[PDB]
Design a binder for this molecule. Structure first.
Ligand SMILES: Cc1cc2nc3c(=O)[nH]c(=O)nc-3n(C[C@H](O)[C@H](O)[C@H](O)COP(=O)(O)OP(=O)(O)OC[C@H]3O[C@@H](n4cnc5c(N)ncnc54)[C@H](O)[C@@H]3O)c2cc1C
Ligand SMILES: Cc1cc2nc3c(=O)[nH]c(=O)nc-3n(C[C@H](O)[C@H](O)[C@H](O)COP(=O)(O)OP(=O)(O)OC[C@H]3O[C@@H](n4cnc5c(N)ncnc54)[C@H](O)[C@@H]3O)c2cc1C
Ligand SMILES: *SC[C@H](NC(=O)CC[C@H](N)C(=O)O)C(=O)NCC(=O)NCCCNCCCCNC(=O)CNC(=O)[C@H](CS)NC(=O)CC[C@H](N)C(=O)O
Ligand SMILES: *SC[C@H](NC(=O)CC[C@H](N)C(=O)O)C(=O)NCC(=O)NCCCNCCCCNC(=O)CNC(=O)[C@H](CS)NC(=O)CC[C@H](N)C(=O)O
Lengths: 461, 461
């Protein structure tokens, strides 16, 4: 049994970041990775995604090339190519990580970890036992795909992972999901050719965001050429000689249900879930407490119910983004190794950007969460709806919607929601501001940048 | 003599904005405009500019279309077209302004104003006299072009105005200036075809910005294909049968001066100055005090040395941007009409974005202004130099440089400087933060957006 000071299971974002801060404060640390380091962020998430998004933003422009006074192209985008190059980047990234870890002097034990009986907190890896007072579990989370029980033909669908394995742009895409990975997937395929359809249980996507966002984004997906199939779900999937035949039910409120066939489908995407990676961790042997869905349960300091065992990132099932993994992983290293009793991540005002077309940007709480936490009389909302100056000379148009949720007398900006061009790099500055309890005044006292979209967020009337 | 409560001379940004706030607080106001309302911002500045910049950003992409997996185009951009459309937009904008003013019920007296003898503050317009206790002078500023005395062939050069009148992209461009309108002009023409050259007195442009910016921007102009001609100035210009022949002197420090001919020049741009519009205002009749360069002199409340006479915008010669015109014009309306003794514009931390390729973004003071106001021991600078993920798959590359100037113990962020993709909509959030005395910690406590460039500004180490 090799004893350490820190043992971090999983080598993805949350975790790499912790072990790293731990080595920094002086600590005998190891990270147990089952396969590719960099986790999801590098391999099949953030990075591969943004590359494709970036590729998509190029079709949107190729469509406006004529309006801006240049001739045009024709079409035929070769997916094969961009695919290859995106992979060589993931490779470069992995090698950087390989080197970075080995240089910061961290024992990268490689293999599959699990908990044993061993009285005090101890893990095995490929028949070897390692232990250390503090073991952090950062085992991530995987894509949820339906069971053949419920949906016969379930296994025929592909997920984000498989999406990042596509060697050719699928001429006909079908996406099931109304969240962000769904919205994101639907947009890339549509922009890049595939006649796509987004099948959602209700009438709008991103039902978890502000009304304006969930609304404006369903609409934009529509004008973009996506096909929102509302109050629908796949009954069964059947591999024809053509491709796939999706039988889905459209049960619109107030109407009579109708069962439909969706033929010659190239790709059927399960963009419905991220189940935690907890099963074969064999937590059971320590009584490590969990969710009724496998997620590990921790307190406001990332402590499991067991002493010396913690959790961070996707696995815990809260704020499923890379930076929350990092911010939670590194903050821990300081509580422990710097002996800082106040280091914990404040899960409020966490900013999230969704890369649809156009980009969704948002931080803080929504009108409703607000109205509830304050009072219908206490919540004031300012908003704007304009057209980016980018479409003063284009036929192809998209909007930009900005909303500000203020609280109480002083008009404390407690929620900023927006969709529009540049909304990806637009948010962050305001996140810092918002994080530092900015009032509508501070916003209003800031001199504008003209001409910009951002200027609109500070001139709200 | 028609008496009012407010009389605003000039109908541009500063001014329209004031008169407007004045009408809002209940006031008999008028605005005396000599020609096109909207001033410079609409007609020959901000707006016409951003349209062209936007057009330029399209060539930069057309050059990367192949890398992103699509075929290509060929070249031949028709300037004629984009030109036309940009004008119809200025027209739409003017009409909006025409209507807006007439609806907010403001007497738009049209013609050329001037001050008379008349004991108490009084102006004439086309042989008509108007007066009112408060008269604001927002007469703007014009482009400075050399005198035939100094430079024989001076009048042969065109300025920003004329640039916005070009009906065809000039195959050979020559630009004299090392400031932002110069840098901006040089970039658009180069991206859009014209074999351009930027003749500057020294070795770098934007000598007024942070070292990093002034440096990185000279370099980027170079890799972009511009031609920085250092320690050079035009001796004389001569209209040949071909086009123009620029004779310029290259007096590099440590070398021997050399006089050179620059043949077949299509366009020679005077991007050197903005002299105030004060001459025929006939201030003289009131003793309205000024600069040794015509600029009006005011105090920290926009008061001239005469009671009941104020000044705002370009004319005053400070912070020559649209928003400073607005922020100064509207703040005045409240001091006066709302009777607010504290309404004045804090000219510190004013944010400015320069639209070069890539975009320059910056707010607060530089390392040097800082080091001086604090102490070489008291100023700490954090910085990053990375490549936007946009060029993970491109051959064509550009960087991104971010610098943070902190002050004292608490590491107060007192200056943010950057150049890079999306740096146009990136700045503003931080401007609010910076405006509210943000410390490096607040920056550091903000959860990141991944993947973004903005995330880099909050993870500075
Ligand atoms: C498409 C797509 C787009 C996304 N886009 C974004 C985005 O734009 N922005 C964003 O901020 N987030 C995004 N995410 C989510 C985000 O990347 C996750 O929150 C983030 O990956 C951090 O995860 P984590 O640290 O919990 O570890 P994970 O990334 O899940 O990685 C854990 C690592 O642990 C290893 N492992 C598992 N169990 C064990 C065990 N028994 N022992 C040893 N090794 C084991 C795994 O092999 C893996 O490499 C996206 C996800 C997908 C899929
Ligand atoms: C290229 C170019 C790009 C620019 N880009 C930007 C930018 O991106 N961002 C930015 O924020 N700023 C920019 N500016 C500068 C900015 O637009 C000025 O600060 C801004 O125009 C505000 O000016 P002002 O309010 O003092 O009035 P001005 O815009 O100069 O307008 C004054 C109006 O007054 C009228 N007038 C003059 N004298 C009299 C008198 N005797 N009586 C009656 N009428 C009279 C004029 O006809 C004019 O229409 C740019 C300028 C140029 C040229
Ligand atoms: S996808 C892995 C992810 N990376 C980030 O979040 C980058 C942000 C920040 N620079 C950071 O903290 O790394 C992540 O989960 N990283 C966490 C981790 O545990 N970090 C350990 C310490 C690593 N710090 C070393 C800094 C330089 C290392 N660089 C690389 O590993 C290569 N690139 C990156 O990791 C990221 C994503 S691949 N780089 C970029 O995104 C490019 C720059 C910019 N943010 C952009 O989006 O263009
Ligand atoms: S170029 C004139 C300039 N306009 C602005 O600075 C716009 C910012 C802000 N919305 C504003 O205060 O107008 C300016 O000098 N304006 C000052 C003026 O004196 N204002 C009087 C009151 C006008 N407020 C009415 C709001 C709606 C009016 N809209 C128009 O006049 C048309 N468009 C605009 O004025 C601007 C520039 S043409 N619109 C945009 O830039 C588009 C939106 C976004 N900012 C973008 O850049 O895409």
């Amino acid at each position: 049994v090799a004893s350490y000071d820190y043992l971090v299971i999983g080598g993805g974002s949350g975790g790499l970041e912790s072990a790293w801060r731990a080595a920094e404060l002086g600590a005998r640390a190891a990270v147990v990775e089952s396969h590719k380091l960099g986790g999801t962020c590098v391999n099949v998430g953030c990075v591969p995604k943004k590359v494709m998004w970036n590729t998509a933003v190029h079709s949107e422009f190729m469509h406006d090339h004529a309006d801006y006074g240049f001739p045009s192209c024709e079409g035929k985008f070769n997916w094969r190519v961009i695919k290859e190059k995106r992979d060589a980047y993931v490779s470069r990234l992995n090698a950087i990580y390989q080197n970075n870890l080995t240089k910061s002097h961290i024992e990268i034990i490689r293999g599959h970890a699990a908990f044993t009986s061993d009285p005090k907190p101890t893990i095995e890896v490929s028949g070897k036992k390692y232990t250390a007072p503090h073991i952090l579990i950062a085992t991530g989370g995987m894509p949820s795909t339906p069971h053949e029980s419920q949906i016969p033909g379930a296994s025929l669908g592909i997920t984000s992972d498989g999406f990042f394995q596509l060697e050719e742009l699928p001429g006909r895409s079908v996406i099931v999901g109304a969240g962000y990975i769904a919205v994101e997937m639907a947009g890339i395929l549509s922009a890049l050719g595939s006649k796509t359809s987004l099948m959602i249980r209700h009438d709008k996507v991103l039902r978890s965001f502000d009304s304006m966002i969930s609304t404006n984004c369903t609409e934009e997906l529509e004008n973009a050429g996506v096909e929102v199939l509302k109050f629908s779900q796949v009954k069964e999937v059947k591999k024809t000689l053509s491709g796939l035949e999706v039988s889905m039910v459209t049960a619109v409120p107030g109407r009579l249900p109708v069962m439909t066939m969706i033929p010659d489908v190239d790709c059927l995407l399960w963009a419905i879930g991220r189940v935690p990676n907890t099963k074969d961790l064999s937590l059971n042997k320590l009584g490590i407490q969990t969710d009724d869905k496998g997620h590990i349960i921790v307190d406001e300091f990332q402590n499991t119910n067991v002493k010396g065992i913690y959790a961070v990132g996707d696995v815990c099932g809260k704020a499923l983004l890379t930076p929350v993994a990092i911010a939670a992983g590194r903050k821990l290293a300081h509580r422990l190794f710097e002996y800082k009793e106040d280091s914990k991540l404040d899960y409020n005002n966490i900013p999230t950007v969704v890369f649809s077309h156009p980009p969704i940007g948002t931080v803080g709480l929504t009108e409703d969460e607000a109205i509830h936490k304050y009072g219908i009389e206490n919540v004031k909302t300012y908003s704007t709806s304009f057209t980016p100056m980018y479409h003063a000379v284009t036929k192809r148009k998209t909007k930009c919607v900005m909303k500000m949720v203020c609280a109480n007398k002083e008009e404390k900006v407690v929620g900023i929601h927006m969709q529009g061009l540049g909304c990806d790099e637009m948010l962050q500055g305001f996140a810092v501001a918002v994080k530092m309890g900015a009032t509508k005044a501070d916003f209003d006292n800031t001199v504008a940048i003209h001409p910009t979209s951002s200027e609109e967020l500070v001139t709200l009337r």
